[PDB]
Amino acid sequence: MLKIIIPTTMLLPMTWMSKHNMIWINATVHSLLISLISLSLLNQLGENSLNFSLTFFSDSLSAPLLVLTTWLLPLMLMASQSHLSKETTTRKKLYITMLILLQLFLIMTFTATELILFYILFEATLVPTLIIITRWGNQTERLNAGLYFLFYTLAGSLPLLVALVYIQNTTGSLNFLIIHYWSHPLSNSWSNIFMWLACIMAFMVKMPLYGLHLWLPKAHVEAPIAGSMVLAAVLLKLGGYGMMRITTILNPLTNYMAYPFLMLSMWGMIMTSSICLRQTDLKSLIAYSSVSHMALVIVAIMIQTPWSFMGATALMIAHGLTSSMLFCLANTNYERVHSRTMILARGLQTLLPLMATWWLVASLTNLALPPSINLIGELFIITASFSWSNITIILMGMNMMITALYSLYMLITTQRGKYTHHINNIKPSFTRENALMALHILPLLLLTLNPKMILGPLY
Amino acid sequence: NVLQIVRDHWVHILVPVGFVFGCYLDRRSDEKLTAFRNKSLLFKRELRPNEEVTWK
Amino acid sequence: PTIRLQEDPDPEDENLYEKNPDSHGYDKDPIVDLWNMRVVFFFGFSIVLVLGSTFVAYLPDYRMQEWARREAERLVKYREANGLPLMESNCFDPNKIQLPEDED
Amino acid sequence: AKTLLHKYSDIPEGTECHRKAYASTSIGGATGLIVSAYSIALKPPASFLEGVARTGRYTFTSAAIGAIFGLTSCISAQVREKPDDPLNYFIGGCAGGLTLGARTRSYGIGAAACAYMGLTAALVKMGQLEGWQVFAEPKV
Amino acid sequence: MNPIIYTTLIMTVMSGTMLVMISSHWLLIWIGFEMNLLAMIPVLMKNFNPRATEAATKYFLTQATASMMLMMAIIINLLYSGQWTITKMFNPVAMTMMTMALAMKLGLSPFHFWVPEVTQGISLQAGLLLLTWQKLAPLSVLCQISQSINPNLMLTMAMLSILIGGWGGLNQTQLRKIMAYSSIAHMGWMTAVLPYNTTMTILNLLIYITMTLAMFMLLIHSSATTTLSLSHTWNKMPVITSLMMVTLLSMGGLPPLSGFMPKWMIIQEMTKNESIIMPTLMAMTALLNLYFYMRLAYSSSLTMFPSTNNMKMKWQFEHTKQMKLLPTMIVLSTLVLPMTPALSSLN
Amino acid sequence: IARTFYDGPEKNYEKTMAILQIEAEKAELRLKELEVRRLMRARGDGPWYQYPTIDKALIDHSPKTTPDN
Amino acid sequence: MTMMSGRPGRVPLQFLPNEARSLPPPKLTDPRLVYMGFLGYCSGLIDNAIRRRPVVSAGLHRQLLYVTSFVFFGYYLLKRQDYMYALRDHDMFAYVKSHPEDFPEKDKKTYGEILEEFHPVR
Amino acid sequence: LLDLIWLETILPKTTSFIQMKMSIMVSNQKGLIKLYFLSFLITIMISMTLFNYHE
Amino acid sequence: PFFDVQKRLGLDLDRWMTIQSAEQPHKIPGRCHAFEKEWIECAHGIGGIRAEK
Numbered sequence A: 001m002l003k004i005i006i007p008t009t010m011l012l013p014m015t016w017m018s019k020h021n022m023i024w025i026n027a028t029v030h031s032l033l034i035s036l037i038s039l040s041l042l043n044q045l046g047e048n049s050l051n052f053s054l055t056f057f058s059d060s061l062s063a064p065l066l067v068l069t070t071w072l073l074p075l076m077l078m079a080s081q082s083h084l085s086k087e088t089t090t091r092k093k094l095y096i097t098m099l100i101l102l103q104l105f106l107i108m109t110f111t112a113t114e115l116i117l118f119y120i121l122f123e124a125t126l127v128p129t130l131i132i133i134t135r136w137g138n139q140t141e142r143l144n145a146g147l148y149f150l151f152y153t154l155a156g157s158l159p160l161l162v163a164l165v166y167i168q169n170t171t172g173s174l175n176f177l178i179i180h181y182w183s184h185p186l187s188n189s190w191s192n193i194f195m196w197l198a199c200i201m202a203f204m205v206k207m208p209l210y211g212l213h214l215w216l217p218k219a220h221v222e223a224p225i226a227g228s229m230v231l232a233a234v235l236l237k238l239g240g241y242g243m244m245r246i247t248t249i250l251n252p253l254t255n256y257m258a259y260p261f262l263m264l265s266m267w268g269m270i271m272t273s274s275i276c277l278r279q280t281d282l283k284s285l286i287a288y289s290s291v292s293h294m295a296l297v298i299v300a301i302m303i304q305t306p307w308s309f310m311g312a313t314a315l316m317i318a319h320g321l322t323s324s325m326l327f328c329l330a331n332t333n334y335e336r337v338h339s340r341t342m343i344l345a346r347g348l349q350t351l352l353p354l355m356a357t358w359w360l361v362a363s364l365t366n367l368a369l370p371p372s373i374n375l376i377g378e379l380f381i382i383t384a385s386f387s388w389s390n391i392t393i394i395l396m397g398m399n400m401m402i403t404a405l406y407s408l409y410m411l412i413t414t415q416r417g418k419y420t421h422h423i424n425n426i427k428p429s430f431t432r433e434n435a436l437m438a439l440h441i442l443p444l445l446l447l448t449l450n451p452k453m454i455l456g457p458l459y
Numbered sequence B: 001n002v003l004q005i006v007r008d009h010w011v012h013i014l015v016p017v018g019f020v021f022g023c024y025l026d027r028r029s030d031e032k033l034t035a036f037r038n039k040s041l042l043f044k045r046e047l048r049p050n051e052e053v054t055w056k
Numbered sequence C: 001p002t003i004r005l006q007e008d009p010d011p012e013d014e015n016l017y018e019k020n021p022d023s024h025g026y027d028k029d030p031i032v033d034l035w036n037m038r039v040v041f042f043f044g045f046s047i048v049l050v051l052g053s054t055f056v057a058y059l060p061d062y063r064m065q066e067w068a069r070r071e072a073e074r075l076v077k078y079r080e081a082n083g084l085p086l087m088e089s090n091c092f093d094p095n096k097i098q099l100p101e102d103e104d
Numbered sequence D: 001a002k003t004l005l006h007k008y009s010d011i012p013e014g015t016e017c018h019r020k021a022y023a024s025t026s027i028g029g030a031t032g033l034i035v036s037a038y039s040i041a042l043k044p045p046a047s048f049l050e051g052v053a054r055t056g057r058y059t060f061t062s063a064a065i066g067a068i069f070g071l072t073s074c075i076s077a078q079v080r081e082k083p084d085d086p087l088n089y090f091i092g093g094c095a096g097g098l099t100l101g102a103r104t105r106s107y108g109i110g111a112a113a114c115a116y117m118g119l120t121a122a123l124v125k126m127g128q129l130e131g132w133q134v135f136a137e138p139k140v
Numbered sequence E: 001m002n003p004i005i006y007t008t009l010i011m012t013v014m015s016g017t018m019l020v021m022i023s024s025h026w027l028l029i030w031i032g033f034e035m036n037l038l039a040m041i042p043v044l045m046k047n048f049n050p051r052a053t054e055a056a057t058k059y060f061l062t063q064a065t066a067s068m069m070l071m072m073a074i075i076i077n078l079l080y081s082g083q084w085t086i087t088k089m090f091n092p093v094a095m096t097m098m099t100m101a102l103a104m105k106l107g108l109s110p111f112h113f114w115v116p117e118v119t120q121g122i123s124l125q126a127g128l129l130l131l132t133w134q135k136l137a138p139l140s141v142l143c144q145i146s147q148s149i150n151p152n153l154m155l156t157m158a159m160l161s162i163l164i165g166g167w168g169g170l171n172q173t174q175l176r177k178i179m180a181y182s183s184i185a186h187m188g189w190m191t192a193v194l195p196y197n198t199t200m201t202i203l204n205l206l207i208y209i210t211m212t213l214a215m216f217m218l219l220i221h222s223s224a225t226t227t228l229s230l231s232h233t234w235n236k237m238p239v240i241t242s243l244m245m246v247t248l249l250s251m252g253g254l255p256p257l258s259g260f261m262p263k264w265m266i267i268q269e270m271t272k273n274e275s276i277i278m279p280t281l282m283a284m285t286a287l288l289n290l291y292f293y294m295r296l297a298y299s300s301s302l303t304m305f306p307s308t309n310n311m312k313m314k315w316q317f318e319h320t321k322q323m324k325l326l327p328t329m330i331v332l333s334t335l336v337l338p339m340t341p342a343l344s345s346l347n
Numbered sequence F: 001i002a003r004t005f006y007d008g009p010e011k012n013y014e015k016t017m018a019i020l021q022i023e024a025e026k027a028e029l030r031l032k033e034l035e036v037r038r039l040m041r042a043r044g045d046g047p048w049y050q051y052p053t054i055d056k057a058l059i060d061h062s063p064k065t066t067p068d069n
Numbered sequence G: 001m002t003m004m005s006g007r008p009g010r011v012p013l014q015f016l017p018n019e020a021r022s023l024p025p026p027k028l029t030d031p032r033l034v035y036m037g038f039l040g041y042c043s044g045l046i047d048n049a050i051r052r053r054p055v056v057s058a059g060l061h062r063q064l065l066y067v068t069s070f071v072f073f074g075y076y077l078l079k080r081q082d083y084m085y086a087l088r089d090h091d092m093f094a095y096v097k098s099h100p101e102d103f104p105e106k107d108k109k110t111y112g113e114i115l116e117e118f119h120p121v122r
Numbered sequence H: 001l002l003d004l005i006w007l008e009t010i011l012p013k014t015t016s017f018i019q020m021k022m023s024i025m026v027s028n029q030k031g032l033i034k035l036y037f038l039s040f041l042i043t044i045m046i047s048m049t050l051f052n053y054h055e
Numbered sequence I: 001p002f003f004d005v006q007k008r009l010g011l012d013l014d015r016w017m018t019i020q021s022a023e024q025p026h027k028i029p030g031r032c033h034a035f036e037k038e039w040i041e042c043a044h045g046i047g048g049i050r051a052e053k
C-alpha cells in the first residue's frame, strides 16, 4: 500500500519545487500516473481481503473508492486552473497542496485496518476541505457554510470517538479482522441502544441523512468547483463505507434500531426530489439530488442484505462520477455568465452543441438509464427493499418519477428554448472543458462492461 | 546542453522514486510477517530440492 | 468624499481567444497551453483509459469463479452418478455437533 | 445535600405520591435558592426588597417545577402500573417544562423546556435502571 | 525596571515554583507559593498603568486568599495527624479546603473571574508567563495528593471550568481575554482526568503550554491585542497569519493536529473507569472553544480585511528582535500526533 | 499479468494468519492489563500504585531525657 | 492516579535506569527517528520563513543543527519509552504469575458444542 | 417550511441562540471584586456543606 | 510534580522536620513519640494503600 501513499506524498515537494508555469502540467501528469498505479488494486481474492500489513488492507469495497479518489484528483486540477489564473504562484501551490493532502487522507482512510486510525483520518479530511471552502469560495456565505460543515460533522463524530474507545476497552481490540471474527450479538438494553446511536450518527450525518442534511447545500454551493467535486464524489461516501464497516458488530439490534432512519431516508428522498423541482439555483439542485441518492444508499445499508450492499456500492461509485460531471457542467456556465441562476442563460444548445451533448449524457446518467451502473445499483437496492417489504415499491417508483422529472427539467431549462438576447459573452467551449467532461463520462460507460469491479465484497 | 534542462526538470523523478521506494518498503513489510510461511494446514507443502522458501 | 474606502474597480474577465484564437483554455502562454493539452490528452486518454481498461479486462481470475464452476461440475457429477442428493440441508456434519442433552 | 436525593429515592417509584412530590419540591427549592443566591451575588438587585422578590420568584418557580415533575411522574407510574419505565419520567419532565413556560409566560420556552426536561428525566431514569455513573470512582 | 532586577524577579518566581516542586514539607510548599507570589506581583506591573495596577491588585487579593486557605488546611491536617509530609491528607475537611485553595490558585470555575481581567490588564509577555508558568506548582501539588481528592467536587469544578471557558470565550473581541478563557477551559480538561491518571494531566499540561507559548509568541510578533488589529497582519506578514491559523486549528482539538491527542487520551482513560457521560459532555462543550477559534481564524487568515495607508511604511522594516523558540513551538503544537506512544516516558 | 504483477494466494493467506495472531495476542494482552491494573489499584500489593509512606530511617532510637520515650 | 512513580528501587532523576541496557536499542533508521528528523527539518524551514529568508536554501548549517538536535533527543526519548513499556509488561506478567487464583485457566469449548443464538436477517 | 424554516429552527438556530444567551450571561460581569468575592464565599459555603458532609 | 532532589542527592533539606520522632534538640521527645514510632514502622515500605488497612 506504500506504493500508492509514497508517490502521493512526493506530489507535495514536486509541486513546491516546480516553476511558476509548470505546476498544473506536472501535478496533472503525476496524478494521472498515480491513478494508473492505484488501478492495480482491483485484483481481489474473493474469500478474504488483501492484507498488505498490520496497518493497511484492501477490500473489494475499498478498491473502487480508492481508484475513484485517485482519478478524481486530476479532474479537480483540470477544473481548478481556469478560475485560479490570476492567483499568485504561492497561493496556487497552497491550493494544490490542499488537494494533495485531501487525497492522502482519503487514500489512507479507506485502507486502515483499525477503527481509531480510520476515525483520525476521517476527521483529518475536514481541515483541507474547510480551508478550501473558506479561502477560495466566491461568495460571502462561504464562512457560514464552512461553520455548518464543520460543526454538523463534529457533533456526530465525537460520540463515535467515545463509543470506539469504550468498545476497545470492553473487547480488547478495534482491528477490523478481530472485530469481525469475534463478533457477539448486542443485547436489547438502553446502554446498547446508545452505543448503536453513537456508532451510527456520525456516518448518518456524513451521508447526509434527511433532517441532518442542511450543511450540504451550503457547503456544496458555496465551495469552489474542486471543493464541490470532492464533496459530492468522495466525501459523501465516507459515511457509507463507515456504516458497512461498523454494522458488523451492531447485530441484532439494527433489526429495529433502523426503523426511524429508514422512514427518514425514504420520505426525505421523496422530499428532496420534490425540492429539486422548485430550485432557482443550479448547484442547489445537484446538491439535493445528491441528498436523494445518498438517502437511497442509507436505506440499502440499513436493510443489511448482500444485494443491498452490492447496489449501495454501485450507486456510490456512479453517483460520485455523475455528480462531479454535473458540478463541472454547471461551473462552465457559471464561468461564462458569472451567475448561478438557472433561467439567466437559456437555449445554450444553439450556442454550445457539444456541451449540450455532455449535458444530455449527464442528465441521462443522473436518471439512471439502463444499462448504466446507476440503475444497476438503484435496481439492486429497490429489489432488496422489496424483499424487505413489498410496500417500498410505491416510494421507489415515486422517487424514480420525480428524479426523471427534475433531471429533464434542468436539461430543458438550461439547454432548450431560445437564447437570452442581452447575454453576448458566451465563447466557444475550450478543449479543457470538453476533455474534463469526456474524462468524467467515459469511465462511467466503460464500467458497464465490467460491473463486478464496483459491486463490492458481497459479489 | 543538459545542465539547464536537468536543473529545470529534475522534479519529474520524485514520484517514480517514491513509487519504487514504496514497493521496496512493501516488500520489507512483507518480510516481517513470515511466521506462518509453509505452516498453514491448507497450504503446507514439501519444498522443492533447490528452493529455500515458498514465498518471499 | 461620499466614498467608504479606496478600492480597485472590479476588472473585466479577459478572453483567452482574444490574444490566441486557438488557445485550448489551459494557459495564457501558447506553448505551455499546447503542452498542457498534449500531456492531459496523452496521460488520460492514451495511458489511463485504454491501457488501464485492457489491464482490468485481462485481470487474472483470482476471484475463483472458473475454479468454483469446475468444482461444482465435479461435485454434481459425483453426486448424481451415485444417486446422492445434490445438496444437504445441513452445512456441517451432525456427528461433530453436541447439542444440549435435554430440551425440557 | 445528597440526603435530599436519598429521601426522594428511598420512596418507591409508584407509591406514596405526596411524599415523593414533597421531596422533589424540596430539591427544587434548594436549587432555586442556590440560583437566587448566585444571581444576587453577581448582579445586585439595587434594593433589599427587590432582592427578596427575586429570591422568592426564583425559589417558587423551581419548587413548582419540582412539585409538578414529582407529582406527575409518581401518578403516571402508579396509574400505568409501569414502574422502571422512562416514559413516566419523560411525562413528568415535560409537565415541569410546561410549568416553567407558564411561569415565564412564553410558549416557546414552555415547549423547549417540555422537550429538554423530559428527555433529561428519561435519561436519568435510564441511568438509574442500568447503573450509569456520572462521577465515576477511579477503579483502574 | 532595571534588567538585572527583572532577571532576579523572574529567577525568584521560577525558584519559588521549583521549591513547590521539590519540597516534602507542607511549610516549604507554602513558602514556595508565597515567594512565587511576592516575585510575581512586580512582573505584572512592569509597564506602569492603572489597568496593570488593577490587575496586580486583583491577582494579589485572590492569591493571598488562596494562600490563607492553603495554610488553614495544612494546619487542620496537622491537628488531626501530627504529619507535615505531603503524602495524603488525613482529614476530609482539610482536603476540601486544600482543593478549594488550589482551584482558586489555578483559576478553576467558579473561581475563574480573576483570570480574564488580570490577563487583559497586563502585557503579552506577562500574560504568557501568567498563563504558562503559574500553573505548574498547584498542578504538581494536586498530582501529589491525587489519591485523596473527592472526585465529585473536582469533576464538578472541571466541568464548570470547561463550560464557562467556552461560554466566556464566545463573547470576546480582545485576544487576551480569549486566551484567558481558553486557559480556563484547558485547566478544566486537565483537572477532569487528575483523579484517574496524573500522567494524562502532565501530558495535557505539556501540550497546552506548548500551544499557548506558540500563540502568545505569534501575538507578540504581530503586535496586536484586538481582533481588528490582528486583521491587519495579512497585509504585512502572511506567513505569521497562516501559522496562527494552523495553531488555532490545533488548539481546537481537530485531528490530525497535536491538540487532539490530550483530549483523545483523556477520553479513553476516563472510559477505562466506566466514565462515559462526562467525556461526551466535555467534547461537546469544547466545540464552543473550537467555534471562537474558528471565528478568530476567519477574521485573521482565511479572509482579507481592509487595511490602512500607513502600512506601506511598515512594509520597509524588518523585525529588530527575533524569538528563537517560536519555530520549534509551532512544530510541536501542530505536528506531534504520530509520536503519541512517547507519553509512557512521562510516568 | 499474474506472473508480472502478483503472487500466489498462499503468501496473502499466511500473512493474514500472522496478522491475525498478532492482533489476537494484543487484544488478550490489553484485557489482561486492564484486569491487572484493576487488581493492583484495589489491593495495593503489586508494584504499581505504590503511594509513599514515612521512611522509618528518620526515627531517632536514642534515650529521650525520659524513660517512657 | 499515579501508577509507576512509587515502584520500588526507582532512582528519582535518572531518565534511564541501568536495567534498560538489557533491552535492544532502537535502530538508527527507526521510522520514529526519521519522523523526529522530519520535524526538525520543518522547524528549520519555518525558522527560515519567519525571518523572511529563502525557505529552502538560506540556512543549511541551521537546518542541519535542527535535524541533528531533533534526532539526538528522539533517540533517548524512544529508549526511555521502550524501557517503560518493558517495565509495564514485566510487572504485569509477574503479577499474573504470582496471583493464579485471579487469572484462572478455564477449559475452552469447541463451537460445535457451544450453543449460539441465531438472529435471522429479514 | 421544512428545510428553510423548521429544520433550521430545531438543530442549528436553537444551538446558536442558546449559546449566545449563555455567553452573554456568563461574560457580562461588571468587573467589581466585591461581587466576585461574594460569589467565592457562596461557593465555599456550598462545597463545605453539599460536598464536605458527604463522605 | 515531585522531583525528589533530596533523595537523589541525599541532602535532607526539610525531612528533619516532617515527623515528631526525628532527632529533636537535646533529645526532647514528642508527647506521642512511641505511638508514631510504632505506626511508622508498621507502614514502612508496604505502600499507602496497604498502610491504611
Ligand SMILES: CCCCCCCCCCCCCCCCCC(=O)OC[C@H](COP(=O)([O-])OCC(O)COP(=O)([O-])OC[C@@H](COC(=O)CCCCCCCCCCCCCCCCC)OC(=O)CCCCCCCCCCCCCCCCC)OC(=O)CCCCCCCCCCCCCCCCC
Binding pocket: A442, C049, C050, C051, C053, C054, C057, C058
Ligand atoms: C474511438 C474514438 C472515439 C471515442 C472512443 C470511445 C471508446 C474508448 C475506449 C477506451 C478503451 C477501452 C478498452 C477496452 C479493452 C477491451 C479488450 C477486451 O476485453 O477484448 C475482449 C475480446 C477478446 O477476447 P479474448 O479473451 O482475447 O479471446 C481469446 C480466445 O480464447 C481466443 O480467441 P480466437 O482464437 O478466436 O482469436 C480470434 C482472433 C482471430 O480471429 C479471426 O481472424 C477469424 C475471424 C473470422 C474470419 C472469417 C472470414 C475470413 C477468412 C475467410 C475469408 C478468406 C479466405 C476464404 C476466401 C473465399 C473466397 C470466396 O482475433 C480476435 O481475437 C478477435 C479480435 C480482438 C480485437 C480486440 C480489440 C480490443 C481493443 C481494445 C482497445 C480499443 C480502443 C478503441 C480503438 C480500437 C481499435 C479501433 O474481444 C472482443 O470481445 C471482440 C468482440 C467480438 C464480438 C462478436 C460479435 C458479437 C455480437 C453480439 C451482439 C449482437 C447484437 C448487436 C451488437 C453489436 C455490438 C457491436
Ligand SMILES: CCCCCCCCCCCCCCCCCC(=O)OC[C@H](COP(=O)([O-])OCC(O)COP(=O)([O-])OC[C@@H](COC(=O)CCCCCCCCCCCCCCCCC)OC(=O)CCCCCCCCCCCCCCCCC)OC(=O)CCCCCCCCCCCCCCCCC
Binding pocket: D033, D036, D037, D038, D040, D041, D044, D045, D046, D047, D048, D049, D050, D051, D052, D055, H038, H042, H044, H045, H048
Ligand atoms: C472555614 C470556612 C467557612 C467560612 C464561612 C463562615 C463565615 C462565618 C462568619 C459570619 C459572622 C459575621 C462576620 C461579619 C462579616 C462582615 C460582612 C460585611 O462587612 O458586610 C459587607 C456587605 C456590603 O457592605 P456595604 O457596602 O457597606 O453595604 C452596601 C449595601 O449592603 C448594598 O446596598 P443596596 O441596598 O443598594 O443593595 C441591595 C441589597 C440586596 O440585599 C439582598 O437582596 C439580600 C436579601 C435576600 C433575602 C434572602 C431570603 C430570605 C429567606 C431565605 C432563608 C433560606 C431558608 C428558606 C427555607 C424555605 C423558606 C420557606 O444589598 C446587597 O446587594 C447585598 C447582598 C448580600 C447579602 C448577603 C450575602 C449572602 C450571599 C448572597 C445571597 C443572598 C440570599 C439568597 C439566599 C441564600 C441562602 C440563605 O454588607 C452586606 O451586604 C450585608 C450586611 C452584612 C451582615 C450579614 C453577614 C453575615 C453572613 C456571613 C455568612 C453567613 C453564615 C456563615 C456560616 C453559616 C453556616 C456555617
Ligand SMILES: CCCCCCCCCCCCCCCCCC(=O)OC[C@H](COP(=O)([O-])OCC(O)COP(=O)([O-])OC[C@@H](COC(=O)CCCCCCCCCCCCCCCCC)OC(=O)CCCCCCCCCCCCCCCCC)OC(=O)CCCCCCCCCCCCCCCCC
Binding pocket: A009, A013, A016, A017, A090, A091, A094, A097, A101, A104, A127, A128, A131, A135, B014, B017, E238, E239, E242, E243, E245, E246, E256, E301, E302, E330, E334, E335, G042, G045, G046, G049, G053, G054, G055, G056
Ligand atoms: C501526512 C503525511 C506528510 C504530510 C506533510 C505535512 C504537511 C507539509 C509539511 C509542513 C511543514 C513543511 C513546510 C513548513 C515551512 C514552509 C513555510 C512557508 O511559508 O513556505 C514558503 C515556501 C515558498 O516561499 P519561497 O520559496 O521562499 O519564495 C516565495 C515567497 O516567499 C512568497 O511567499 P509569501 O510568504 O510571500 O506568500 C504568502 C503566503 C504565505 O503563506 C504560506 O506560505 C503558508 C505556510 C503555512 C505553514 C504550515 C503550518 C506549519 C506546519 C503544519 C502542517 C499541518 C499539516 C496537517 C494538515 C492540516 C493542513 C493545514 O500567505 C498566503 O498566501 C495566504 C494563505 C492562507 C491560506 C490558508 C492555508 C495556509 C496553511 C496551510 C498549511 C498546509 C501544510 C503546509 C504545506 C506546505 C507549505 C509550504 O515554501 C517552500 O518553498 C518550502 C516547501 C517545502 C519544500 C521542501 C521540500 C524538500 C525538497 C525535495 C527533497 C525530497 C525529500 C525526500 C527525498 C526523496 C528522494 C529523491
Ligand SMILES: CCCCCCCCCCCCCCCCC[C@@H](O)O[C@H](CO[C@H](O)CCCCCCCCCCCCCCC)COP(=O)(O)OCC[N+](C)(C)C
Binding pocket: A188, A189, A190, A193, A210, A211, A212, A257, A260, A261, D085, D086, D087, D090, D119, D122
Ligand atoms: C432530524 C433527524 C435527527 C436524527 C434522528 C435520530 C433518531 C433517534 C431515535 C432512536 C430510535 C428508537 C430509540 C430506542 C428504541 C425504542 C424507544 C422506546 O420508545 O421504545 C419503548 C421503550 O419504552 C419507553 O418508551 C421508554 C422510552 C421513553 C422515553 C424516551 C423519550 C422519547 C420522546 C421523543 C424525544 C425526541 C428524541 C430525538 C431528539 C432530536 C419500548 O418498550 P420496552 O420494551 O419496555 O423498552 C425496550 C428497552 N429495554 C429493553 C431496555 C427495556
Ligand SMILES: CCCCCCCCCCCCCCCCC[C@@H](O)O[C@H](CO[C@H](O)CCCCCCCCCCCCCCC)COP(=O)(O)OCC[N+](C)(C)C
Binding pocket: A039, A064, A065, A067, A068, A071, A317, A443, A446, A447, A449, A450, A454, C048, C049, C052, C053, C056, C057, C058
Ligand atoms: C464519438 C464517436 C462515437 C462513435 C464511434 C463508436 C465506436 C464503437 C463504440 C462501441 C464499442 C462497443 C464495445 C463493446 C465491448 C467490447 C469489448 C468488451 O467485450 O470487453 C469488456 C472489457 O471491459 C473492461 O473489462 C471493463 C472496463 C474497465 C474500466 C476501467 C477504466 C479505467 C479507470 C479510469 C478511472 C475510473 C474512475 C472510477 C473507478 C471506480 C468486457 O470484457 P469481458 O467480456 O469480461 O472479457 C472476456 C474475455 N476476457 C475476460 C479474457 C477479457
Ligand SMILES: CCCCCCCC/C=C\CCCCCCCC(=O)O[C@H](COC(=O)CCCCCCC/C=C/CCCCCCCC)COP(=O)(O)OCCN
Binding pocket: A151, A152, A153, A154, A155, A156, A159, A162, A163, A166, A190, A191, A192, A194, A195, A197, A198, A199, A201, A202, A205, A212, D123, D130, D131, D132, D133, E274, E276, E277, E280
Ligand atoms: C450533528 C447532529 C448529530 C447528533 C448525533 C448525536 C447522537 C450520538 C449518540 C449518543 C451520544 C452518547 C453515546 C455515549 C457513548 C456510548 C458508550 C456506551 O455505550 O456506554 C453506555 C453509557 O450510556 C450512556 O451514558 C448514554 C447516556 C446519554 C448521555 C448524553 C445524552 C445526550 C442526548 C442523547 C440522545 C441523543 C442521541 C441521538 C440524537 C441524534 C441527533 C439528533 C453504557 O455504559 P455503562 O455505564 O458501562 O453501562 C453498562 C454497565 N452498567
